[PDB]
């Protein structure tokens, strides 16, 4: 009941996936809205697209 | 307190106003007729009629037909010395094995 059903079977599928999604969501949405920053990101993306993709 | 919230009302008892209550509704007449329709339809109609319908369902699974066919085949085979159960479901003459 406790160790398997309520702790580890909760830790493997539903809790770890939710934690990963929350962390990635915070990482993606943690932007200060600076055009300089994301336009430099645009420049990096343009260079990567030009070079890596052939 | 942080809200203007109603207090939790006390639980209501149907037997308080209607001593002979079936528990279906507050109105006595509607309660009685709900009980009547539930009991009549459910018990009488569904239980009795559906159960006798299932009991007297026609033998579409061919249990009796299969028994009669097996009896005829056993009679024919044992009356002529043939095996009662064939060793092959299909004909080796009609089966062409690869070489």
């Amino acid at each position: 009941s406790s160790l398997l059903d309520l702790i580890w079977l909760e830790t493997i599928l539903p809790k770890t996936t939710s934690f990963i999604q929350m962390k990635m969501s915070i990482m993606v949405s943690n932007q200060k809205g600076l055009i300089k920053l994301y336009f430099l990101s645009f420049l990096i993306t343009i260079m990567i697209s030009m070079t890596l993709f052939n | 307190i942080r809200l203007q919230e109603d207090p939790d009302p006390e639980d209501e008892n149907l037997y308080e106003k209607n001593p002979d209550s079936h528990g279906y509704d507050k109105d006595p007449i509607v309660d009685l007729w709900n009980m009547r329709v539930v009991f009549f339809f459910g018990f009488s109609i569904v239980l009795v009629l559906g159960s006798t319908f299932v009991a007297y369902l026609p033998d579409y699974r061919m249990q009796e037909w299969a028994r009669r066919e097996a009896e005829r085949l056993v009679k024919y085979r044992e009356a002529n010395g043939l095996p009662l159960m064939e060793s092959n479901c299909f004909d080796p003459n009609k089966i062409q094995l690869p070489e």
């Binding site: 406790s2 160790l3 702790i7 | -």
Partner: protein, 52 residues
Amino acid sequence: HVTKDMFPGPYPKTPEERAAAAKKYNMRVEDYEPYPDDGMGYGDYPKLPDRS
């Protein structure tokens, strides 16, 4: 009628927390003893004697 502060909580770390937990469970501070913090999820629930 039970308030949110009258529910089992985390493992008590300080004497203030232990005193609050003992008061919560209607138990004396000296008689209150939580399960060891092994990460098994007991929390601040008291470890009453194993008798029936």
